[PDB]
Amino acid sequence: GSSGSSGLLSHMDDPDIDAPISHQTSDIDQSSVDTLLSFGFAEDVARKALKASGGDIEKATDWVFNNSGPSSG
């Protein structure tokens, strides 16, 4: 549960204009998974919800409820 940001200098195109390698990690933003971590969910489910929802927290927050199981072994 944390995040930050800062810096400005004509940045309109990509956060990294020098890396011919498909962005790492699924579309599921890491910051998002955390956004749910604070809410009150397991990072795992945070990704599962953001996996079906797709970043959309409001959807992820629901996904958790919509579907989910006890414990995770």
Count other Cβ atoms within 10 Å, centred on residue 68: 13
Query: What token pair was written down for 20?
Result: 């011919």
Q: How many Å apart are CA 13 and CA 15, to the nearest integer?
A: 7
Q: Determined by which method?
A: NMR
Contact by Cβ (8 Å): 14, 1 = no
Here the CATH number for the domain that contains residue 60 is: 1.10.8.10
Domain of residue 40: give its range: 1-73
Which of 10, 48, 47 minimizes the C-alpha distance to 31? 47
Q: How many domains does the chain have?
A: 1
Query: What token pair was written down for 38?
Result: 């604070």
Query: What token pair was written down for 54?
Result: 């797709």
Q: How many Å apart are CA 28 and CA 8, to the nearest integer?
A: 25
